[PDB]
RNA sequence: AUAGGAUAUGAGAAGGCAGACCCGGGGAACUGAAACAUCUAAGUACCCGGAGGAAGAGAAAGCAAAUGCGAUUCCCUGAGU
RNA sequence: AGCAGAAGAUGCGGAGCCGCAGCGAAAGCGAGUCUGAAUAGGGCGCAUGAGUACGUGGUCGUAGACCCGAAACCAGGUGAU
RNA sequence: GUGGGUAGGGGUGAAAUGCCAAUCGAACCUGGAGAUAGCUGGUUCUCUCCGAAAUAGCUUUAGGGCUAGCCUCAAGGUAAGA
RNA sequence: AUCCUUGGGAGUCAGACUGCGAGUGAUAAGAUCCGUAGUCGAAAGGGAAACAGCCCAGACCGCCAGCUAAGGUCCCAAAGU
RNA sequence: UAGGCCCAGGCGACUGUUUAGCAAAAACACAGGUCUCUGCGAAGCCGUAAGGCGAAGUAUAGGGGCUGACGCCUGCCCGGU
RNA sequence: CUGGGGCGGUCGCCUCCUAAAAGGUAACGGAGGCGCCCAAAGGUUCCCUCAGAAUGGUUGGAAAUCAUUCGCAGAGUGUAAAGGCACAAGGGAGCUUGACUGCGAGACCUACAAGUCGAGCAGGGACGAAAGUCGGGCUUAGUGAUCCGGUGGUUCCGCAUG
């Protein structure tokens, strides 16, 4: 039997040209009253996974 | 797994979606073309085989 | 044996957010990084170094920092390029 | 009384913003303005 | 007139077992989810009815969107998409 | 996968897969693409060029997953000599 | 005494949580079952090269874990390192 | 002679004691909880009579070789009544 | 081989029953006292139901609860539930 | 969580001290506070400087007000400690809404998630003659992931085509 994707992983994260994948940050849609707007024009970019937590999870979306 | 604080796939958020239908017109790059000395009729039926 | 008598009232604290000098007096040093932290003005700004939102101290235009007195017994920052 | 509401647009009708106001202190239908992308200029934002 | 009662005829069928495989009716829990109740485990085990050497399905109210394919079944891809 | 082949190599099968180029959610565009009013900036990538298939080992995912062990749970039967 | 019924998320009890084949806050058997165990015990031949930590952020979390922290192998960079 | 990146690969996330600086404590505890340094842990040898933490010092292996450190130099017991 | 008595107390009317295999007791039973439901294809029962207990019973009888011979009694609150 | 546990108390955020002259650095150690408030208590132009004390006075009083010296700050700085502030960031006027869209070279901090500072560019402003400042309150608190639904907008997709 294969592996499976993990495929909640796979719904929140972009496989770039190698890669460092890709997110979007958190804290990024609930609430907006108390967030100013420069911590706001700074989520609303994407992000790159933190080198850390990248080696717990390339073992799981190597499906893609 | 992340001890029982909740992990970093569920701390970030999803991104929707994919197509319905996507096509992907690929690939030729250019330089391929000079498999043709001197060459003419580049058809993908000529470039399949 | 014992008895069940408390309670302590004073157990809390903030998170430690740090200050003091980033850089050092001889620092090339790029534009817009952080030379020192303050809560105030400890230490005023002079050539090519603004002031923060946090009153922070950071260099515009790049070189050396050089840390001086104003005179009696009070604190510059300028930085002085190559 | 202190409510956070959108200051929404009269040149293209869009909201744009969240300001703090009061609504003992500022019972009015209250009106700013500011810059609207769409509108590209200064526009006049009454509260919605 | 019927229920029913009597009589003869049926090389009818009830039982079994290859502890398996295949339909259908019922059908759990433990385990995981790091707790657990949605879920999973799992229509799994187990019980019960069917038989056949196989069973089930099947000749279109089918796929599919072109210059179309033409009953079901099985295998590999499709794809852990 | 299948077809010949001592259940074997091997032959043939291109069906499919990975790579040959990315960028955005996406329409799509393309040595760029997104975000962008922006021939501003910046993110990912290019210039700078190695993959792929099999074999060995370190691993890890799914299965009892390294061995031995719970108390209890659930289904179905036997037992008031 | 004989003969005979009441069957286990039930029976039965002039009631104690008693008794149900020497077993009772849920009888025994067979299976799901190799249930699970953050917990304890065990982890079988030799030599060399290096060689840790018992700290932190978090955590239904404190005798568990996950990133860092320190170790080791390999490849680049080069003299950054003190 | 180390360091930086990069990847594979694990262990520990309960430590103790002594000195120096601290809190709690009663300027109590082989007490608890921090910094700093050592040692132990993972370190054998000699001292301290025996002694995981003090003092000295690092065990590749043999020698019926020599010189020293801590501690000693009447007998036990090597070395100065 | 066949009883030791006699005062004075607390509990429980009594003979009985129980923790087989630690506890026979001041526990439980008990007649009596009550409160309540039930008109009989019944009240409650065991049943998925059929059937049956209740019962070849019929409110002077059944089921449920409380309290426990006998004597004297059983005071007050329907706010809550 | 714990000087066994229970009961008590605390769980998160900002400030101080313990903290050993960088920076962190623990305990059921020692103190306070924080889940807001300001349409101006914001931005800018331009002015001005406190508290207390003494002297004398209107009902005037130990003190409201009013005048003259003192008064480097013993005053304020929204709210509470530390730092800082009179050339003001403290008080008063006027004009205002920058309490700004797209960013962001680069840094700080750190497991990550986060969080913080930003020179500079463009779009249009505000105040100001200009110089120029302005991406909220002197700084540090006043806030919380993801999923799920709703609202405004979408020269996005839409299951044969519309």
């Known amino acids: 039997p294969k592996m499976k994707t993990h495929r909640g992983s796979a719904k929140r994260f972009k496989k770039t040209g190698s890669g460092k994948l890709k997110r979007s940050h958190a804290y990024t849609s609930h609430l907006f009253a108390n967030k100013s707007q420069k911590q706001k024009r700074k989520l609303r970019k994407s992000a790159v996974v933190s080198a850390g937590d990248f080696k717990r999870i390339k073992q799981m979306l190597a499906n893609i | 797994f992340e001890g029982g604080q909740m992990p970093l796939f569920q701390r970030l958020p999803k991104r929707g979606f994919t197509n319905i239908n996507r096509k992907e017109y690929a690939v030729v790059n250019l330089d391929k073309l000079n498999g043709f000395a001197e060459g003419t009729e580049v058809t993908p039926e000529l470039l399949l085989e | 044996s014992k008895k069940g008598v408390g309670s302590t009232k004073n157990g809390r604290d903030s998170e430690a957010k740090r200050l003091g000098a980033k850089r050092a007096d001889g620092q090339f040093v790029t534009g817009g990084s952080i030379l020192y932290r303050q809560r105030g003005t400890k230490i005023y700004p002079g050539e090519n170094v603004g002031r923060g939102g946090d009153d922070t101290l950071f260099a515009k235009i790049d070189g050396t920092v050089k840390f001086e007195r104003f005179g009696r017994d009070r604190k510059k920052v300028s930085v002085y390029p190559v | 009384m202190r409510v956070?509401?959108?200051?929404?647009?009269?040149?293209?009708?869009?909201?744009?913003?969240?300001?703090?106001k009061n609504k003992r202190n500022n019972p009015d239908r209250v009106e700013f303005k500011k810059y609207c992308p769409r509108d590209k200029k200064s526009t006049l934002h009454r509260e919605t």
């Open chain 4, 4 to 20: 956070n509401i959108t200051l929404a647009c009269t040149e293209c009708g869009e909201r744009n913003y969240i300001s703090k």
